[PDB]
Design a protein around this ligand. Sequence first.
Ligand SMILES: [K+]
Ligand SMILES: [K+]
Ligand SMILES: [K+]
Ligand SMILES: [K+]
Ligand SMILES: [K+]
Ligand SMILES: [K+]
Ligand SMILES: [K+]
Ligand SMILES: [K+]
Ligand SMILES: [K+]
Ligand SMILES: [K+]
Ligand SMILES: [K+]
Ligand SMILES: [K+]
Ligand SMILES: [K+]
Ligand SMILES: [K+]
Ligand SMILES: [K+]
Ligand SMILES: [K+]
Ligand SMILES: [K+]
Ligand SMILES: [K+]
Ligand SMILES: [K+]
Ligand SMILES: [K+]
Ligand SMILES: [K+]
Ligand SMILES: [K+]
Ligand SMILES: [K+]
Ligand SMILES: [K+]
Ligand SMILES: [K+]
Ligand SMILES: [K+]
Ligand SMILES: [K+]
Ligand SMILES: [K+]
Ligand SMILES: [K+]
Ligand SMILES: [K+]
Ligand SMILES: [K+]
Ligand SMILES: [K+]
Ligand SMILES: [K+]
Ligand SMILES: [K+]
Ligand SMILES: [K+]
Ligand SMILES: [K+]
Ligand SMILES: [K+]
Ligand SMILES: [K+]
Ligand SMILES: [K+]
Ligand SMILES: [K+]
Ligand SMILES: [K+]
Ligand SMILES: [K+]
Ligand SMILES: [K+]
Ligand SMILES: [K+]
Ligand SMILES: [K+]
Ligand SMILES: [K+]
Ligand SMILES: [K+]
Ligand SMILES: [K+]
Ligand SMILES: [K+]
Ligand SMILES: [K+]
Ligand SMILES: [K+]
Ligand SMILES: [K+]
Ligand SMILES: [K+]
Ligand SMILES: [K+]
Ligand SMILES: [K+]
Ligand SMILES: [K+]
Ligand SMILES: [K+]
Ligand SMILES: [K+]
Ligand SMILES: [K+]
Ligand SMILES: [K+]
Ligand SMILES: [K+]
Ligand SMILES: [K+]
Ligand SMILES: [K+]
Ligand SMILES: [K+]
Ligand SMILES: [K+]
Ligand SMILES: [K+]
Ligand SMILES: [K+]
Ligand SMILES: [K+]
Ligand SMILES: [K+]
Ligand SMILES: [K+]
Ligand SMILES: [K+]
Ligand SMILES: [K+]
Ligand SMILES: [K+]
Ligand SMILES: [K+]
Ligand SMILES: [K+]
Ligand SMILES: [K+]
Ligand SMILES: [K+]
Ligand SMILES: [K+]
Ligand SMILES: [K+]
Ligand SMILES: [K+]
Ligand SMILES: [K+]
Ligand SMILES: [K+]
Ligand SMILES: [K+]
Ligand SMILES: [K+]
Ligand SMILES: [K+]
Ligand SMILES: [K+]
Ligand SMILES: [K+]
Ligand SMILES: [K+]
Ligand SMILES: [K+]
Ligand SMILES: [K+]
Ligand SMILES: [K+]
Ligand SMILES: [K+]
Ligand SMILES: [K+]
Ligand SMILES: [K+]
Ligand SMILES: [K+]
Ligand SMILES: [K+]
Ligand SMILES: [K+]
Ligand SMILES: [K+]
Ligand SMILES: [K+]
Ligand SMILES: [K+]
Ligand SMILES: [K+]
Ligand SMILES: [K+]
Ligand SMILES: [K+]
Ligand SMILES: [K+]
Ligand SMILES: [K+]
Ligand SMILES: [K+]
Ligand SMILES: [K+]
Ligand SMILES: [K+]
Ligand SMILES: [K+]
Ligand SMILES: [K+]
Ligand SMILES: [K+]
Ligand SMILES: [K+]
Ligand SMILES: [K+]
Ligand SMILES: [K+]
Ligand SMILES: [K+]
Ligand SMILES: [K+]
Ligand SMILES: [K+]
Ligand SMILES: [K+]
Ligand SMILES: [K+]
Ligand SMILES: [K+]
Ligand SMILES: [K+]
Ligand SMILES: [K+]
Ligand SMILES: [K+]
Ligand SMILES: [Mg+2]
Ligand SMILES: [Mg+2]
Ligand SMILES: [Mg+2]
Ligand SMILES: [Mg+2]
Ligand SMILES: [Mg+2]
Ligand SMILES: [Mg+2]
Ligand SMILES: [Mg+2]
Ligand SMILES: [Mg+2]
Ligand SMILES: [Mg+2]
Ligand SMILES: [Mg+2]
Ligand SMILES: [Mg+2]
Ligand SMILES: [Mg+2]
Ligand SMILES: [Mg+2]
Ligand SMILES: [Mg+2]
Ligand SMILES: [Mg+2]
Ligand SMILES: [Mg+2]
Ligand SMILES: [Mg+2]
Ligand SMILES: [Mg+2]
Ligand SMILES: [Mg+2]
Ligand SMILES: [Mg+2]
Lengths: 142, 97, 152, 129, 24, 79
Amino acid sequence: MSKTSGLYTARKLRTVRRVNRWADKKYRKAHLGTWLKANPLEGACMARGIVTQKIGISAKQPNSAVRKAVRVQLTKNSKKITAFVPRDGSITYIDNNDEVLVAGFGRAGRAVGDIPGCRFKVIKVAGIGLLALFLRKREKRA
Amino acid sequence: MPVKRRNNGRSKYNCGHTNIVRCQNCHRCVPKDKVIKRFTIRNIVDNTIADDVLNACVIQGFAIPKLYNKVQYCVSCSIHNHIVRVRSREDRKIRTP
Amino acid sequence: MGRMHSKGKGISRSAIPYTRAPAPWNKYTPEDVCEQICKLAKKGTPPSRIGLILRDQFAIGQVKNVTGSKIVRILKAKGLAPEIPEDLYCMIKKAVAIRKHLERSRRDKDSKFRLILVESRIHRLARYYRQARRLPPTFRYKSDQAAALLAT
Amino acid sequence: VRINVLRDALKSICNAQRIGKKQVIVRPSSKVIIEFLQLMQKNGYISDFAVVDNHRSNRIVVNLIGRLNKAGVISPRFDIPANDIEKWVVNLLPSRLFGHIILTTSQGIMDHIEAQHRQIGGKVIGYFY
Amino acid sequence: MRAKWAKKRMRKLKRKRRHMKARS
Amino acid sequence: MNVDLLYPDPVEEQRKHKLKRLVQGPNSYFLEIKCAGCQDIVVVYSHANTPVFCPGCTSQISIPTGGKCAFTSQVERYR
RNA sequence: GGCGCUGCUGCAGUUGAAACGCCCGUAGUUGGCCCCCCGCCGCCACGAGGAAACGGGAGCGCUCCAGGCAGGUUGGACCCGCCGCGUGGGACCGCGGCGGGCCCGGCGCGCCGCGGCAGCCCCGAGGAGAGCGGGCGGGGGCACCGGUACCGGCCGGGGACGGGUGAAACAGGAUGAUCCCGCCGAGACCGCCGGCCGCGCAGGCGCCUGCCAAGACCGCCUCUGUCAAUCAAGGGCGAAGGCCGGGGGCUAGAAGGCGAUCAGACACCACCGUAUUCCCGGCCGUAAACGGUGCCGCCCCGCGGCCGGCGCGCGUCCCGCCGGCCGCCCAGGGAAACCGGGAGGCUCCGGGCUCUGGGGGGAGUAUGGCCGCAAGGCUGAAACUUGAAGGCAUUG
Ligand SMILES: [K+]
Ligand SMILES: [K+]
Ligand SMILES: [K+]
Ligand SMILES: [K+]
Ligand SMILES: [K+]
Ligand SMILES: [K+]
Ligand SMILES: [K+]
Ligand SMILES: [K+]
Ligand SMILES: [K+]
Ligand SMILES: [K+]
Ligand SMILES: [K+]
Ligand SMILES: [K+]
Ligand SMILES: [K+]
Ligand SMILES: [K+]
Ligand SMILES: [K+]
Ligand SMILES: [K+]
Ligand SMILES: [K+]
Ligand SMILES: [K+]
Ligand SMILES: [K+]
Ligand SMILES: [K+]
Ligand SMILES: [K+]
Ligand SMILES: [K+]
Ligand SMILES: [K+]
Ligand SMILES: [K+]
Ligand SMILES: [K+]
Ligand SMILES: [K+]
Ligand SMILES: [K+]
Ligand SMILES: [K+]
Ligand SMILES: [K+]
Ligand SMILES: [K+]
Ligand SMILES: [K+]
Ligand SMILES: [K+]
Ligand SMILES: [K+]
Ligand SMILES: [K+]
Ligand SMILES: [K+]
Ligand SMILES: [K+]
Ligand SMILES: [K+]
Ligand SMILES: [K+]
Ligand SMILES: [K+]
Ligand SMILES: [K+]
Ligand SMILES: [K+]
Ligand SMILES: [K+]
Ligand SMILES: [K+]
Ligand SMILES: [K+]
Ligand SMILES: [K+]
Ligand SMILES: [K+]
Ligand SMILES: [K+]
Ligand SMILES: [K+]
Ligand SMILES: [K+]
Ligand SMILES: [K+]
Ligand SMILES: [K+]
Ligand SMILES: [K+]
Ligand SMILES: [K+]
Ligand SMILES: [K+]
Ligand SMILES: [K+]
Ligand SMILES: [K+]
Ligand SMILES: [K+]
Ligand SMILES: [K+]
Ligand SMILES: [K+]
Ligand SMILES: [K+]
Ligand SMILES: [K+]
Ligand SMILES: [K+]
Ligand SMILES: [K+]
Ligand SMILES: [K+]
Ligand SMILES: [K+]
Ligand SMILES: [K+]
Ligand SMILES: [K+]
Ligand SMILES: [K+]
Ligand SMILES: [K+]
Ligand SMILES: [K+]
Ligand SMILES: [K+]
Ligand SMILES: [K+]
Ligand SMILES: [K+]
Ligand SMILES: [K+]
Ligand SMILES: [K+]
Ligand SMILES: [K+]
Ligand SMILES: [K+]
Ligand SMILES: [K+]
Ligand SMILES: [K+]
Ligand SMILES: [K+]
Ligand SMILES: [K+]
Ligand SMILES: [K+]
Ligand SMILES: [K+]
Ligand SMILES: [K+]
Ligand SMILES: [K+]
Ligand SMILES: [K+]
Ligand SMILES: [K+]
Ligand SMILES: [K+]
Ligand SMILES: [K+]
Ligand SMILES: [K+]
Ligand SMILES: [K+]
Ligand SMILES: [K+]
Ligand SMILES: [K+]
Ligand SMILES: [K+]
Ligand SMILES: [K+]
Ligand SMILES: [K+]
Ligand SMILES: [K+]
Ligand SMILES: [K+]
Ligand SMILES: [K+]
Ligand SMILES: [K+]
Ligand SMILES: [K+]
Ligand SMILES: [K+]
Ligand SMILES: [K+]
Ligand SMILES: [K+]
Ligand SMILES: [K+]
Ligand SMILES: [K+]
Ligand SMILES: [K+]
Ligand SMILES: [K+]
Ligand SMILES: [K+]
Ligand SMILES: [K+]
Ligand SMILES: [K+]
Ligand SMILES: [K+]
Ligand SMILES: [K+]
Ligand SMILES: [K+]
Ligand SMILES: [K+]
Ligand SMILES: [K+]
Ligand SMILES: [K+]
Ligand SMILES: [K+]
Ligand SMILES: [K+]
Ligand SMILES: [K+]
Ligand SMILES: [K+]
Ligand SMILES: [K+]
Ligand SMILES: [K+]
Ligand SMILES: [Mg+2]
Ligand SMILES: [Mg+2]
Ligand SMILES: [Mg+2]
Ligand SMILES: [Mg+2]
Ligand SMILES: [Mg+2]
Ligand SMILES: [Mg+2]
Ligand SMILES: [Mg+2]
Ligand SMILES: [Mg+2]
Ligand SMILES: [Mg+2]
Ligand SMILES: [Mg+2]
Ligand SMILES: [Mg+2]
Ligand SMILES: [Mg+2]
Ligand SMILES: [Mg+2]
Ligand SMILES: [Mg+2]
Ligand SMILES: [Mg+2]
Ligand SMILES: [Mg+2]
Ligand SMILES: [Mg+2]
Ligand SMILES: [Mg+2]
Ligand SMILES: [Mg+2]
Ligand SMILES: [Mg+2]
């Protein structure tokens, strides 16, 4: 019957499911424990760090552009990341020592769109929300 | 690549392995049940002189001897020398000689 | 049958009559076919061949219909049943024959294959007889010792 | 080897009716098969049958009148409390109004309507509709 | 590459690694 | 035409395999033969493959053949 | 949750990812039919006993409401812990000498055969094993043995080229080749017949004669009495190439050498040739080891061919039965090609058992372990990367 039947086979039916559960990439990513170790944010929604550089990144094949990003050192584990800055003209609030709050792009650690090697993005600069800085609701000191 | 023929291109029924023959044109190795096989009976002298040998023969009641040859070729040599042709999908089912 | 140790699938077998009664021409009583059975067992005839002889000479289709018991049971009732049942004995005989053939021919792998099959069947049947109390609990088939037990 | 004689009987009957046959032979017979055919008869899905003796496992000859949409068994025979019957009714049956799930209980073999009429449970053996 | 020759290449690679790790 | 499976015609039932009949039964039977030189008569199985002798003779009077058996110089019956 | 993309209900495994090369076999899982009205499990029902809050739920206008337990004789009813305990059922699923009198309230314990009992065997599977008869077949092992051919040598003859290719060149020849005929040696091989023939567990299997053990099928009024199915661990066999130690050595021929071709040719084509190819004793354990289709069991419109055994009929045939190998094909199935002796009887989903897969890469890699003389084999990740890869089919 391609599966075992019979009134006394509960142990086998449970062993098979336990073994074949690991064959799914989603389950293996969320349950094995290697992704939690390798995750730069250590399983958190966001993380703060200091900017070490400003950079421009080429887009992928069918598009043509220079995307604006920053290399960031993490406070809590001293890892190296790169984070994207959205919203036209926003790369002008980022001095080379500016505490930044950084979150993900969505897709839970996968690159999106046309930016090669980018999985994070800046949401706050030196204490102030970057979106409200673009919408002209608050301003930086000087 | 789906399956092209029900016989898989050979005549092998209820056995594991069959004998090897050498193609008579190029000498490659072919299994015996796949090789193209033809039998020929011909005269040793060509028909265009078959009456001049006969009229210049001293023995009374002589009969021209014959030759018996079984020719066996591989698939490539059979197609190249036109012993068999590439056929339409419908025509491939025909076994008539 | 011919299906435990091959891909046979044959169905050749015998089918016995529905009516369970003596023959119209049956003169014999149970006490006089038990006589012939015991004379044939004393003479050394195995129980499967006794039925053949009674069928072919004495015109008796089934012994059960004329007596009410079976051949091996009658032998057991008169103390003339064998120590080892006939089928296990025949399998041991065939194993001894194949081993003795293999002693001269060490390059015969087909015979080694069939020897394995026979001995597996022997062990399974020996276990059946042992747990059924038709054989001593210490019964064991031993390949090396099997030639001289056939004498006893 | 042969394990579920009732399963083979019901497959044979469904095949024979799908062809459009009047009679069908099923072998071997058994007490359970006779109980199942008796229930099918009493609901009106089959006509007369006959068990023929052969000093062995017998045969059965079944007469067919074209009323059987489907018949099957449930293996293994799971046990069912009184309150799970309906969670099985909307699983196997084409509706809540016709069809029959057959249970064995300590009060005999019976369909599900009588099983909730006597408010008891049992073990499922099959279904027809 | 034809997979047979890729397998040949990989076997030569693994044998080179075993030989280099044999030292020390 | 309307056959009933519960009462099959015996003639077309004898031509089927002994096991797939409605009620399985044997194919063989017994029969009487007369010794070519003795007045008496003996009863013989139809599918014998074991020696069968005369009451007087010491020559075996049957030939096993893999099916129904043949006999040497004797004349037979059916009962 | 979507997601039947984790599938017990309920997935997929011919070709998309996926049936171990094959046979044996322990643990495990599963196991035909039959006696009813006893015992012991399981199972179903109803009880007893233990906590509230939460969750359900009877009644009530905090103005409604999330709430709360209120209130105008009252009320806060009831249900929900559990593989244990008690009562009942008993379909389904298993497992299993007696009386009387001594004797006396019972039970044991022995004592008398005392004359009371029908004293103490379902059946014989279109399960299986054993038997006897009969044919059947490139099934296996050992010894022996014929035939031409390829190669090599020798005698005689005769006298200019022979070989090789698409065309040529290197090899050969007045030391007489090539060619013709006779004689000799050695080692391989087994043609035509040779097949929609046949055999074996698969890998595989073809000269003569002799010996040896086996096998499936058929036939049967022979014997036994469930002795079975599938199988982690474990055991055995396993094309070719390859390895160790001996032997042999014709042919072909990895490597190597050499003549052409070509821009180049270290290749394809020509010529010479080492290991190897063959025998013996071991090792290795892999193939598109393919029907790309695991094993056992049931039902299943038909028309044909061939192989083995048996039976009836006429006068070799002819009609059946069983077992095997094939072709076509209604229904049904399917993404289709196609299958149809299943790939059917399946979203109308449940006969039993074992194995494998879960987008494409990285990768069958790193690492550890076991095995191997080695070459290997078996077991076998992660970081990271990517929007498709793939199947079958249509037109150009
Ligand atoms: K499946
Ligand atoms: K499945
Ligand atoms: K399974
Ligand atoms: K069970
Ligand atoms: K699974
Ligand atoms: K393809
Ligand atoms: K082919
Ligand atoms: K064949
Ligand atoms: K063949
Ligand atoms: K041909
Ligand atoms: K070819
Ligand atoms: K088998
Ligand atoms: K068979
Ligand atoms: K069969
Ligand atoms: K052996
Ligand atoms: K053995
Ligand atoms: K065994
Ligand atoms: K064995
Ligand atoms: K056993
Ligand atoms: K055993
Ligand atoms: K003995
Ligand atoms: K490959
Ligand atoms: K490959
Ligand atoms: K390879
Ligand atoms: K028949
Ligand atoms: K018959
Ligand atoms: K007969
Ligand atoms: K899901
Ligand atoms: K779900
Ligand atoms: K769902
Ligand atoms: K499936
Ligand atoms: K293919
Ligand atoms: K793959
Ligand atoms: K694969
Ligand atoms: K693949
Ligand atoms: K498999
Ligand atoms: K496996
Ligand atoms: K196995
Ligand atoms: K096995
Ligand atoms: K077994
Ligand atoms: K086992
Ligand atoms: K067990
Ligand atoms: K199991
Ligand atoms: K079990
Ligand atoms: K079973
Ligand atoms: K219960
Ligand atoms: K019940
Ligand atoms: K409390
Ligand atoms: K009161
Ligand atoms: K209990
Ligand atoms: K109780
Ligand atoms: K009780
Ligand atoms: K008392
Ligand atoms: K023979
Ligand atoms: K044959
Ligand atoms: K032969
Ligand atoms: K042979
Ligand atoms: K042979
Ligand atoms: K041999
Ligand atoms: K031989
Ligand atoms: K010769
Ligand atoms: K010779
Ligand atoms: K010249
Ligand atoms: K040779
Ligand atoms: K022949
Ligand atoms: K033939
Ligand atoms: K032949
Ligand atoms: K043959
Ligand atoms: K043949
Ligand atoms: K034949
Ligand atoms: K043959
Ligand atoms: K032959
Ligand atoms: K016979
Ligand atoms: K078994
Ligand atoms: K099974
Ligand atoms: K097995
Ligand atoms: K194994
Ligand atoms: K193993
Ligand atoms: K081998
Ligand atoms: K090999
Ligand atoms: K070698
Ligand atoms: K050589
Ligand atoms: K040699
Ligand atoms: K080589
Ligand atoms: K070369
Ligand atoms: K090259
Ligand atoms: K090339
Ligand atoms: K050469
Ligand atoms: K070599
Ligand atoms: K050599
Ligand atoms: K070779
Ligand atoms: K050789
Ligand atoms: K090998
Ligand atoms: K493969
Ligand atoms: K193939
Ligand atoms: K399997
Ligand atoms: K024939
Ligand atoms: K025939
Ligand atoms: K045959
Ligand atoms: K024949
Ligand atoms: K025949
Ligand atoms: K025939
Ligand atoms: K048949
Ligand atoms: K058949
Ligand atoms: K047939
Ligand atoms: K077949
Ligand atoms: K398996
Ligand atoms: K597998
Ligand atoms: K596999
Ligand atoms: K696999
Ligand atoms: K390693
Ligand atoms: K080693
Ligand atoms: K070494
Ligand atoms: K070596
Ligand atoms: K090594
Ligand atoms: K190594
Ligand atoms: K290794
Ligand atoms: K594709
Ligand atoms: K593919
Ligand atoms: K592809
Ligand atoms: K493919
Ligand atoms: K299509
Ligand atoms: K398509
Ligand atoms: Mg088996
Ligand atoms: Mg069978
Ligand atoms: Mg028979
Ligand atoms: Mg028969
Ligand atoms: Mg789901
Ligand atoms: Mg033979
Ligand atoms: Mg081995
Ligand atoms: Mg070996
Ligand atoms: Mg050579
Ligand atoms: Mg050479
Ligand atoms: Mg492999
Ligand atoms: Mg394979
Ligand atoms: Mg395979
Ligand atoms: Mg055939
Ligand atoms: Mg065939
Ligand atoms: Mg076919
Ligand atoms: Mg799996
Ligand atoms: Mg390693
Ligand atoms: Mg290792
Ligand atoms: Mg399409």
